[PDB]
Subunit: 161 residues, 12 copies
């Protein structure tokens, strides 16, 4: 027992309300992106339907894994996620996805914008998150990178060169 | 030969009532998915791990269900709406709480919301069946999968 | 507005004692089929031993998954399954599998007949089950179909020109 | 003491029922064959997606024909999936020879899927009246085929 | 030039040996059946864990009964796994009807596992005397069953 | 220095109408073999039903992969395959599979003969294919070999002492 | 305190020349069984060809894994296996597999007898092996059991009523 | 060779003794956590045994992967890990795990504390590690995050709300 | 017995011409792999995703091909050279552009380079076959795999 | 019927000697696992990679072995002690060095420690077998697996 | 109307062809057996790599012998893979008894591989003249064996 | 729409030319390492050939995954990778790999040096990359770590202690 600590209830790292609130911002935009991604996935029609249909599902998978990661990171640090529909709708920073069928070209533009807005949210909270907890900032880096890849893979469809 | 001669043979498309009925199922499946994840993250207390894990299985089922329903709508020329605003505005499920809840409370809350979702499907079933027997089979899969989840979750709180 | 329902104790579907009794009839014949299937699997000898030995295991697998499905369907709707040995022996409608070794030819006829009997039971309860709960009838259809396929794959050994 | 005593008689179907499944079988096989034809010969804008989706259509149609033929055998009917029979009795419009543009293939194949679904819907009630289990297999065929129709046709859809 | 010359005679076992394996077989089958009964009907605190563990018990017991019946056949004995025989000759206390609490299921099932192990231990030496290889299969059964007993009983254990 | 070629429209290998016609002959017999294989698979009854039923599916699988390979080889070299039902029926060299159920023994002889016929076709076109394009002849060798193996595995049921 | 042993060259278990000679007897009969199993697998014709052809490969697989196990057990205890063709032919106790094709019925009897002989060898060395090294006897039990199961699965083709 | 370096023995990045020593601290606490996790895994008894039994194994897997990663990171940077039992016991900062069977409730509390102490160690060395080698700090982030998740998944059992 | 008596039985080794011919195939396969990845990253426009993905399949094929050829050389006592300098200096493929290119342009460019690679193999085939029929079979696999890729890529740009 | 009538049928439990004997096996398996990893990380020199990899296979075997033994103890109502302090205090294996060691040295060191571990098991085997034949079978698996590892490792250093 | 009419005659091979495949078969089997012998008995520097590579050699040789024997059967020839025949008719130099050093095993096995390839190359043209498809199987054998020779021999190679 | 942004073409993060140029440096050295790794993999001969042969392939896999990641990161941020052979050769910082067969000992030394030079390149651009885009620096950390592990696993062969 020469180097053993004797404490009996050694506590874990707890997030400040500011940190919790910052992760909460990331969470709602990821959930909203997931819902908008499926909406697009179902309702996309026209030239190169299948590619975008499939790519959109891949986007949804990434955003769903991301939201779960963020929420669980909140839980680990004693924060309480709110991913309920009312909260997501009232607090998301993403512009609303339109109703009805939309062309591949329009879906490409719309979805790219909503991905970009989601990355924006993460980049906006990044420094405050990093300052409090360097480990959580790494999760943010993974999210930024995966989302920016999705953005590139989707937007390239509409590129005119 | 017995070969048909038409060049643009049309598919079966759904009445607006039919689309409407599938839309009802769609929003409650999505809401159940979002509430399931909320419960999955925020459940605490006795037998946490079992419920944490089972709630994830409920979410998996509800998500594939919602995707199935929306794609059923699309095949039949209907247009699903799974957006957050629409879901919050039109879901029939009682709202899930925002905060930590005990395993016992989560079991009771989630069972109710599963039952509410099954009820939506049971309420539209006959009108769906009358228009398209094939789509009713999809509804049967949802009822049974969800009723199974309800049993697997609720049994935690069952007395002797 | 809000379409959200108010009740905190929203009830699940309520199943009649007749419904439970009907699935119970299906349950015991599937369990009995599985037990007889293994008996045949172990005790078959003669021309084309290996094929029947193998097919009999596939039948057992289907029948085991079936009985579990039925029993869980009972539980979901607050019925209480009884798959105990005494009850299966006392209430199965299948003729008993004979003791000791049986020829491939005889095993073919016997097991085909036991599948016929098992399907007969499902057909006997079908209409009453479908009227009360169409979703459960769908599971019955899955059972009927898988079993009829097993009967075809087994019985065709004995069919001539 | 609940054990029945007799062979307890096996499975059988009316010749009308068998003929109804036979109608479904030939169109599934024709669809599979036309599907591969389209798969090989499609050219042009968004070739790859259609080439791939058409193979998924063929897979579904092949599994379907198996399911129907096996259902026929289970109930002691006897399927006919031979080339001569399929060509003589299929209700599907003939697939054209030669290469076809992606846009043309989309319209052609959507029609042939729809014709296949039509056949299933045509026999459905007569099949259901004799065997509700068989009807469920028809429901699975309708659903999978109508999904393929949606996934294929969406390429040409203007909004 | 070491090659033997005669059919060199096949495998066989005494009727006493076959009867000893038959005792093990019926209790494994009974255990499997009671296991599923428990699996379906357990309710209450920590339902899910027990529901899942009981299925793992059933898997082990089913594979075991196969192993024993196949061992019997390999040595030209003839197993009896029929419902009537299992019910008439099993040594396991009957599993009760109806739903049972997790705590009650834990105690009930632990006892039935222990009774199954008892049967294996009872015939072990007689089996070993005739065939040491068969005894090894019995050792595998004892070990897997005693592990299941530990994994199940631990739920009720107070320290 | 630079060994790099200058042309921007470097042409692929150019195949004669005779080459396409030769693979077309192979294509229709493989498709016909696959259709007859399924017919036999469904309609075989009698002693050793299960083994033949299973082996026939393996044959169908090989023949289906084969026909796809041949058709794609045609496309690669700008030939246009025709695998449509009418053409297969009108141009296959295989004797037609008889209607209705057939005994295991009869199915063995029939299907073995249809494999023999299919291999015969490949052998008939082989030399002309090999002279124009050795790479394609290699694929023919793969086909011949897999089919001969299928003939062995099926026909040996009927071979005596 | 310290229960740690002092020696730097702690010896492994030392096996008698008799032990090695005993496993060598097992080794050659397993290799011979594997070679005869393949011979039968290739050369069997007649009623139920496919089942026996398949089962014979499973036997070969078991016998090959067995011989490798035995040889490695020899190496672990500083015995030196000899699995060379000349030694196997000169020292195997199995009757030789006859040349040319054999009927399914004959192959059944022959191979069953060769399994019987292989198990006989293991039984002959068993007691001496168990007395010197119980761990090795356990591996012998695994071999005996797998082989007896193979004999059952093969021989039952020829058993009547 | 226009941009090619001409050096023949280009050396890799070498850890300072301070860096090596910091990784060594992480290593022993991860190994100790792994040993204590198994001790708990075997000896946990009572309400919700199975869940904790399984979750504890998942903790052990993570800590074992972690220790291997840390040790290999030391090796790559020319440091020499010491993961021997004597060293771990003499130098771990974790309080000793008690002997004997312990209740689920007590195991939950004990293990949470030891996870927290392990995270503490990593957080204590984090900044010094980051300053010398940003890449290694990322490995630390992965460890912190995985361990804090485990803490949450374990401790939630005892949460009273 | 029929057992041979030699202790150091030699393997078949290739002439310098044979090694040379395989070296030619090797550099064009490597160059095709590098150009395929360039195109994979930099393709933009209509039907991007399909081409992005197909180009990766081309790269996978060309890489396993180059590895096969080099290992064929090694087995026959020849020494492959797959280094960047050698590849740039000796490849027969027209250079791929540095920048973003449209899907239509990438289809045309890549088809040409695949065809150039097949041409190299077809040009060495007969001399390879004459020395070692077994190695020609490897060449056949490369020709057919690459010609398949050419078809799958080029079809995007095909008129009615 | 032949059904037994008791409600709380007891399982076989081990004597303290039996538990003690399994405890002896447990600590040497754990110590071997820790020493195996030490050797795995710190081995350097000729044929490093083979030994690095083989030592990991030894560790995998020893870990599943220790888990098996501890769970055997638990089933029989004995209480394992696998804690670091207990392992260091009671293991019979000679201590592994702290620093880099050559492949040749690591082969010799690890072979000795494997042999020491097998010896512990062989020393308790007969008393274990006498009380519980089923547990002796587990011991046989450990002896053979470890003796296999000893052969696979030691062979590196074997003369002509 | 292109359908042929007769059984259309089955596959067959000349006895010379069958004998040529028989030569390949025995050396593949001998190689497999010597391969395992080497695999078990190799000791010394870089033991593990050689132990593992030799097993990969055995796998290839076993699959090869299967391919050849099955080819023989497909064309209605009758293989002989029995121990007595292999030992009496193999062209491979005998593998020595006892443990051998890694360096010696490398040289020994490389020679036996080369001898096996020699046999395949020896019969190749005669086989090809009757059946070009069979020759392709021989090409696959040559290629896989020559790769194994390279992977094994490289251990002893000095540059 | 209470928190929803109203922007319609929200743009993504764009790399500066400096950032693009820095990733371009990493890219060419990874590609060059991949080509040199294969060259070594084919041409290594002598003592412990097989180990190095296999380890070199593992190095190539890692460097190939790395180059693809770097290039795709450039694409996501609107930079245009150049991985063409001419560019790689003209701009790589790695010393040339020699022609011809080389001993295991020489290959170990040569390859270790080229790995070290590749890590050097990444470490040289690290800070400038981190300053502009923290998320991309994490990808660099993964590359450094994986490469330094490979270096250790390769170089240890030649270590004399
Ligand atoms: Cl795709
Ligand atoms: Cl089979
Ligand atoms: Cl669980
Ligand atoms: Cl290796
Ligand atoms: Fe989660
Ligand atoms: Fe979808
Ligand atoms: Fe269940
Ligand atoms: Fe079928
Ligand atoms: Fe069994
Ligand atoms: Fe295709
Ligand atoms: Fe081995
Ligand atoms: Fe490691
Ligand atoms: Fe390679
Ligand atoms: Fe465990
Ligand atoms: Fe074979
Ligand atoms: Fe990529
Ligand atoms: Mg639990
Ligand atoms: Mg058979
Ligand atoms: Mg596309
Ligand atoms: Mg090595």
């Amino acid at each position: 027992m020469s180097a053993r600590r004797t404490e009996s209830d050694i506590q874990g790292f707890h997030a400040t309300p500011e940190f919790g609130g910052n992760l909460q911002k990331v969470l709602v935009d990821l959930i909203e992106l997931s819902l908008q991604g499926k909406q697009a996935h179902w309702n996309v029609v026209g030239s190169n339907f299948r590619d975008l249909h499939l790519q959109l599902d891949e986007l949804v998978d990434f955003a769903r894994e991301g939201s779960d990661t963020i929420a669980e990171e909140m839980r680990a640090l004693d924060a309480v996620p709110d991913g309920r529909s009312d909260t997501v709708a009232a607090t998301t920073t993403l512009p609303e996805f339109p109703a009805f069928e939309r062309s591949t070209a329009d879906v490409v533009d719309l979805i790219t914008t909503r991905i970009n807005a989601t990355v924006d949210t993460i980049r906006r909270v990044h420094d405050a998150v990093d300052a409090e907890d360097p480990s959580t900032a790494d999760l943010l880096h993974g999210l930024i990178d995966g989302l920016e890849k999705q953005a590139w893979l989707i937007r390239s469809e509409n590129r005119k060169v």
